[PDB]
Amino acid sequence: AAKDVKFGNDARVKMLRGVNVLADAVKVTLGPKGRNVVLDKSFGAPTITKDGVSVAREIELEDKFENMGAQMVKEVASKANDAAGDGTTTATVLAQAIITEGLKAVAAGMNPMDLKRGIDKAVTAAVEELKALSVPCSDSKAIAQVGTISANSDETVGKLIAEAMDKVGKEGVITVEDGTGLQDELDVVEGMQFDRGYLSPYFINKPETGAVELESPFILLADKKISNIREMLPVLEAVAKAGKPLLIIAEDVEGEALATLVVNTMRGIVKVAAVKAPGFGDRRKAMLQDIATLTGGTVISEEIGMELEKATLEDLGQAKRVVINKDTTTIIDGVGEEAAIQGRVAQIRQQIEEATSDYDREKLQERVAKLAGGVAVIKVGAATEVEMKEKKARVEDALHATRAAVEEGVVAGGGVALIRVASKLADLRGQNEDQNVGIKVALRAMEAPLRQIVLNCGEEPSVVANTVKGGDGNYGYNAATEEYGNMIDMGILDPTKVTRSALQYAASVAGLMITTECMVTDL
Amino acid sequence: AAKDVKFGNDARVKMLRGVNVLADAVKVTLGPKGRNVVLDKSFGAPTITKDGVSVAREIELEDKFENMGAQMVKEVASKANDAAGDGTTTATVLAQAIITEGLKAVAAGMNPMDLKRGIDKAVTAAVEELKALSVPCSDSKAIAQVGTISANSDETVGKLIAEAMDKVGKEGVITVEDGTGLQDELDVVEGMQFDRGYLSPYFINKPETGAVELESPFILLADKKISNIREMLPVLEAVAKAGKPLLIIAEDVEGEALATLVVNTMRGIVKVAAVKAPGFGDRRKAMLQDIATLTGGTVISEEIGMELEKATLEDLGQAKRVVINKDTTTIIDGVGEEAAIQGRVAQIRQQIEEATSDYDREKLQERVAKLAGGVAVIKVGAATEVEMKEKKARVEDALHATRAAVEEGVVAGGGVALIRVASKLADLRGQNEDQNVGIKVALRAMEAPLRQIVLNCGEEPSVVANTVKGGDGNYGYNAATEEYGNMIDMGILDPTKVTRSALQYAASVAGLMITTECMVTDL
Amino acid sequence: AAKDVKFGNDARVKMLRGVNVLADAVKVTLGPKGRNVVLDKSFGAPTITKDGVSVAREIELEDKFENMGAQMVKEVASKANDAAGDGTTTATVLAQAIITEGLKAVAAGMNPMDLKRGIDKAVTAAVEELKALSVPCSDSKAIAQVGTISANSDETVGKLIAEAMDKVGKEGVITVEDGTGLQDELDVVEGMQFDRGYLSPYFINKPETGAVELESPFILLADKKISNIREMLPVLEAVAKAGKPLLIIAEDVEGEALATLVVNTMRGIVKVAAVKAPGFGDRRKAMLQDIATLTGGTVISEEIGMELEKATLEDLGQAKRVVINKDTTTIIDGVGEEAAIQGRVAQIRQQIEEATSDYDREKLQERVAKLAGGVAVIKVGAATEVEMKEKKARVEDALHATRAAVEEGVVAGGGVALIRVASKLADLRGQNEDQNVGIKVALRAMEAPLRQIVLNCGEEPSVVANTVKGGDGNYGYNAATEEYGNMIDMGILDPTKVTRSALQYAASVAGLMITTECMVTDL
Numbered sequence A, B, C: 001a002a003k004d005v006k007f008g009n010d011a012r013v014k015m016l017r018g019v020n021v022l023a024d025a026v027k028v029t030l031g032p033k034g035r036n037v038v039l040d041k042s043f044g045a046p047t048i049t050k051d052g053v054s055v056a057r058e059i060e061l062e063d064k065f066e067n068m069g070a071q072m073v074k075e076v077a078s079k080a081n082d083a084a085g086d087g088t089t090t091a092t093v094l095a096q097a098i099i100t101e102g103l104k105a106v107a108a109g110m111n112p113m114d115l116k117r118g119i120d121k122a123v124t125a126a127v128e129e130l131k132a133l134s135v136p137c138s139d140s141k142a143i144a145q146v147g148t149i150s151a152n153s154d155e156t157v158g159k160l161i162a163e164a165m166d167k168v169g170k171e172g173v174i175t176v177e178d179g180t181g182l183q184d185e186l187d188v189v190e191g192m193q194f195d196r197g198y199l200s201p202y203f204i205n206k207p208e209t210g211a212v213e214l215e216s217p218f219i220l221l222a223d224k225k226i227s228n229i230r231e232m233l234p235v236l237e238a239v240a241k242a243g244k245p246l247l248i249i250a251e252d253v254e255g256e257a258l259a260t261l262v263v264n265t266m267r268g269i270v271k272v273a274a275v276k277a278p279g280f281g282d283r284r285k286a287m288l289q290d291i292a293t294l295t296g297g298t299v300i301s302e303e304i305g306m307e308l309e310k311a312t313l314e315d316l317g318q319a320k321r322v323v324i325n326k327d328t329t330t331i332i333d334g335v336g337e338e339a340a341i342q343g344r345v346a347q348i349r350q351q352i353e354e355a356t357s358d359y360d361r362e363k364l365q366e367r368v369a370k371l372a373g374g375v376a377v378i379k380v381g382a383a384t385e386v387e388m389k390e391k392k393a394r395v396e397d398a399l400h401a402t403r404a405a406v407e408e409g410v411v412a413g414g415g416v417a418l419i420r421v422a423s424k425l426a427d428l429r430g431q432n433e434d435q436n437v438g439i440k441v442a443l444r445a446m447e448a449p450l451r452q453i454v455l456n457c458g459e460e461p462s463v464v465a466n467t468v469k470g471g472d473g474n475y476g477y478n479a480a481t482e483e484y485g486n487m488i489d490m491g492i493l494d495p496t497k498v499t500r501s502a503l504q505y506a507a508s509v510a511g512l513m514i515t516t517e518c519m520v521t522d523l
């Protein structure tokens, strides 16, 4: 359609206004004194959330240029959520700070591409300094504290995550789901988890989580690829009067002969899903055999000759819950048979004792780790649904932060790590003066998380930023108690991955946006 | 419908206003100090782009006559992008300059057709002078510099293109695709590339690139043309539950019995495509055999008697990525078997040693060059999707510019080549005075790229244009450093094809538009 | 009333938009290639004028903040017109340039008060350098050239002013008035001129010149101050049926018993005016006696005892034209008696021969200079009234410029003097960096007159500014012939007072306006 085309300062101030609307809505949530945001839903009751990416996602502005700025910055929170599952508000605050100071530099006549290059150089150096400053999770041993900080100082949530990682291992799979009582429960049940996703984007359920849950599902397993429709239409009908939702695990799944016909079939009462299987050839066969033994099901094959038309519903596997996500699909509780599960575990232990090839040994030890660790499940306890969603979001943040902590390490929380790396980057210089100003813009913007935290405390951000900068090491500002101390000692720990990801995604988007001279949108 | 009809100066100033809106939006992006343009998308987040043709494509105006002018000039950027893949902003700047000065001449009462003839004569002479001024890429040997200049002074991108051309040859196929890390990666993998396009315009995917990508596709090969639908409906169903997207390579593909039925089948989850095969008869058979051996597939034939109904999914070829474009379709990574690939390479080397016919020898050496060079793939590394699109556009510009440089040569960058050829054309005369004024309009307009570059530097375009004109040879103005020097020495190189194409397409459209006395549009 | 209150950038861009509207309307008139502006009048036919202050005065904008900016800049042209009578367009161009560059510096975050201080320091230094660069009019001897340049290269006007100054002296009084023929006539007639103004602001005639003209007036002279109304009401009635307009010359004139009653008397057919007399005591008596002898009138006094009630209309003085202005009031042609005038001249020559006191000698020699020089009158010849107003404005500009040239000297025209003094001020520094930037803003803005002249020539301002800067001395750019040369040799001379006044008034207003953070206006 016809386009509104804005240039220079007018376009930049409109885009910055959109950035500011999104970032203010997100930044009210930052820190232990951060507040909640109510997002209206046409689907049902409004959602009360502290999660920054949720607020960012809901933001859309009437002014098209302001909306453009808001959408580009919303990408920061989305990328931070996708990569680390936490720090989306920190990422938004950093992005807004970089954009604000970089646009001020642009208004000062400095070359915006050189400002972006300086920002990028400063952020690369700051990521290196964050890696250097990071303390490995083995050394720190504060999973409870990391989860507590990520759960908005909910010590119960952090303790639950710590117990789950003590039971299923620091690499074991933990899944958050809605409970029934008022208290958060933890249960380690036998389940499975593989790094695959759904093959159809229309499988999304009513909740907007992007991960689809099925209660008491039926499991179908196949390694050979079926061709004709009429040889599993009876099997499809059998599962279509079994009563339990169908989850198929295969090598790969198409949509033009399976997904389209079935979506033309139902209207959305009960869901049927199909996903890939990890590995290929013998590894995929072993994976499907393990899943079938876990769920009590069977795997069809060409060599066996066991056809689908002879399969019954008792032959197929049965589970209690499955959560399918693009990144990773988990089967929460497959009943099967406990004796059969133990026998398979013993058989694969004999496989440990027999195998000698390095790749075979490592994949088989991955199999035994997945079997022995099991699946930890956290039942979120809340009196109401709005409290359920808020608490589940906080527990999911805690899980993501603890995973990031065991993956990449921890740094001082409360924006202190960014302050320290900014102080360590004070001598960083670019190729010209505009690159130096971009570096300074990035360094000042890495003070923004701490300053926003202090603002959310009702305190003076410049005084606290000055006091933290004047300190050294993990000295920082407890925002829960409004006093200074060693951030590690008071347990205010951030995952290094979370801080680094927030900085990187904020920098990429914000450095791109400060380089914009014209914006084109609809009238 | 009813038509608004405008004449003479009113029509011309409206059309020029539309030209100016489009050209200003595009020209803010010109040069190393050029800035980015944010294009709003209804599909998702706005795209930040320096690419001039992207900005030009997004431009559409409310005023119908201004929109008419904008659309005709948008044709300049589109043609420059189609022909050279670079210089679209230079082409737009040249077109706007020719239009502005030619409309000034028209207002001076000079015959617009004679002005157009003078512009055309000057541009033909300037293309000849650009060919004379061009330095062959073998002599210059600055592929890294050409790619760096085209990538907006991104030395990493230019070095990556230079390494890719050092690995797969200056004629080898290089494909840009989205990476996963933050860094640009280069990998030379075994693949295929042929000069064919899709037979259906509705195969366009969600991205507006015009080239469609498929991840881990299945490969179907056929030289004989099948007739009845029921003899590959089972095979179609097999691929429709194989899980991988289908890509058919045949002699030629229709749409009234294949495309319409399948588009009535799916709603757009997984795509199935079919394309032509290069050559005919024995050459097409050799091409399909080579592709099948690369992907591990098989080729059906009448002499063999191997029917499609007996084909299995293991018999069909499997790849990792394919990119289908109207100009050229590439298979990025076909796994097949490495030993089989090497054996086929040895067999075709024996074919080199055996064949003696000149056409057969040259086509067989083309086959061995395509097999030995392989496919270079550049993984664009970016933290975010908007940065991914911007960086991928810059790398695609660099690839197009390096291809144009090895095809047609290089000239001094920064608009210097056009300045030099304009100086060499100072004595060019037409058949009358209006043709001479058209020649002068073209010659002055070829200063416009340098002048716009200087304007984007915040500097004085007339002073720098005067200084560059007063110099000789590759003397010009480094806009990155705002100082004069030998453009070849500082590595500011433009592909001669890019400069020539920009000038020619700008001239054709602009010379046509300055001849317009009436415009007819909707009310 | 309720106030719209704007802050920061919004207020500044609105004010700059108003500045730009006024300055563009004025600047189209600058230089020999400058064009005319038509100002609509509700009174009658529109006025075509090249005069910059006329255009500036007519400018008023709908947007209140833009109007505010326009009004403050209009003060520049008004002050330049009041002080020098020329250079109002140069003053406006300088003011717009200072405002534009200073607002750019303000947007760059620099302290606007320090920018204003730097501008003021640069302008003080530039005024000193203009005084140093100035060539006295005695040395240059180019009154014809100064008048020609001020009359928009009208050599006839400059020659007329040169002849008038050759006849009545370089200090003699010259008055421009409408002629009757098509040619500009010059006549030196016996008249008087004193530095006084009207005592009532409601005496303004229908033309908006601010100086009121009376044709064939009657002259009344008085040194003693009358008290009762009834003792000159008969005399007032006598002049009220004499037929000629009344002009009273007294010590001082009130309004509450003279002006209010008479303005309640007439409706505006024939005007009666009263003005002060120069000097005091004996000097005022000598002045009134000289004026009475020039006009054939008589002066009342207490010592003489000659009362007003006995005065007749033949006793009162009679003239042909008088022009009354606040700065200076002139009697153009008082008939009186030529023999009486010569006898009075001889008597005052005897007074020269008799007087010895220095103050008495100098005032008496001022008297004899005023009597001997007489009054030069330039009859503007034009076919039409619009041409009459345009030509009269140009001749008035020429008169003001020649007066300024004989007062303060001449410098190279065409903005060259400002370029030279800016070059001589390249090492000027302030107390801080913002003051240095203000100095640079002023120095760059003194290039603006030449650059605007070049723009009005259709040429490239940066190239010509560079060429003029690269020269030295009076080297500059003839804009009439579009070529370089010695500005003094080609007769392009500006009065030093005009250039200095333009710079000073532009600097004062513009430096004040760049310091503005908030604007308050009506809604």
Ligand SMILES: Nc1ncnc2c1ncn2[C@@H]1O[C@H](COP(=O)(O)OP(=O)(O)OP(=O)(O)O)[C@@H](O)[C@H]1O
Binding pocket: A029, A030, A031, A032, A034, A050, A051, A052, A053, A085, A086, A087, A088, A089, A090, A091, A149, A150, A152, A153, A397, A412, A413, A414, A415, A449, A453, A477, A478, A479, A480, A481, A492, A493, A494
């Ligand atoms: N008691 C505390 N004192 C100081 N800083 C704290 C404290 N508790 C948390 N923080 C800091 O608050 C930040 C995390 O805040 P929050 O979890 O509200 O937002 P986020 O992680 O940026 O984003 P989101 O959770 O929405 O993805 C971290 O920098 C953390 O160190």
Ligand SMILES: Nc1ncnc2c1ncn2[C@@H]1O[C@H](COP(=O)(O)OP(=O)(O)OP(=O)(O)O)[C@@H](O)[C@H]1O
Binding pocket: B029, B030, B031, B032, B034, B050, B051, B052, B053, B085, B086, B087, B088, B089, B090, B091, B149, B150, B152, B153, B397, B412, B413, B414, B415, B449, B453, B477, B478, B479, B480, B481, B492, B493, B494
């Ligand atoms: N450092 C530099 N100094 C001078 N000129 C430069 C420099 N870097 C690039 N240029 C010039 O800028 C022009 C290319 O600019 P840019 O890539 O932004 O636009 P384009 O090639 O016209 O169009 P597009 O890339 O949008 O298709 C060329 O003329 C090139 O020589």
Ligand SMILES: Nc1ncnc2c1ncn2[C@@H]1O[C@H](COP(=O)(O)OP(=O)(O)OP(=O)(O)O)[C@@H](O)[C@H]1O
Binding pocket: C029, C030, C031, C032, C034, C050, C051, C052, C053, C085, C086, C087, C088, C089, C090, C091, C149, C150, C152, C153, C397, C412, C413, C414, C415, C449, C453, C477, C478, C479, C480, C481, C492, C493, C494
């Ligand atoms: N032939 C010429 N070549 C170069 N400069 C010239 C020439 N004639 C006049 N100028 C310059 O033009 C300027 C005067 O222009 P103009 O009289 O139109 O405007 P102004 O004096 O600024 O204002 P205004 O007359 O409206 O009060 C001076 O700087 C003068 O030197």
Ligand SMILES: [K+]
Binding pocket: A029, A030, A031, A034, A050, A051, A052, A089
């Ligand atoms: K939060």
Ligand SMILES: [K+]
Binding pocket: B029, B030, B031, B034, B050, B051, B052, B089
């Ligand atoms: K560009």
Ligand SMILES: [K+]
Binding pocket: C029, C030, C031, C034, C050, C051, C052, C089
């Ligand atoms: K003027």
Ligand SMILES: [Mg+2]
Binding pocket: A086, A087, A088, A149, A150, A397
């Ligand atoms: Mg958090």
Ligand SMILES: [Mg+2]
Binding pocket: B086, B087, B088, B149, B150, B397
């Ligand atoms: Mg380019």
Ligand SMILES: [Mg+2]
Binding pocket: C086, C087, C088, C149, C150, C397
């Ligand atoms: Mg003048």
